[PDB]
Amino acid sequence: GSSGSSGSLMDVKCETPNCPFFMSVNTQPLCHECSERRQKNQNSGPSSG
């Protein structure tokens, strides 16, 4: 039903012992939440530039 992504939430809890969310196969050891959250840290600026 239009569901499913590269990564699949496994029975393993997110790396962070404070994150109640599980870590996906493409987000591990972090989860979808943290994963993206971390990305912000590193940025290449505007696509154009």
- Sole window of 5-13, 19-27, 40-48 interacting with Zn ion (rule: CB under 5 A): 19-27
Nearest residue (CB) to Zn ion, 31 versus 48? 31
Per-residue exposure over 3-35, b if at least 16 CB sit within 10 Å of its own CB, e if not: eeeeeeeeeeebeeeeeeebbbeebeebbbbbb
Nearest residue (CB) to Zn ion, 9 versus 33? 33
Length of the chain: 49
**Using the rule CB under 5 A, is 27 a contact of Zn ion?**
no
List interacting residues with Zn ion (CB under 5 A): 14, 19, 21, 31, 33-34
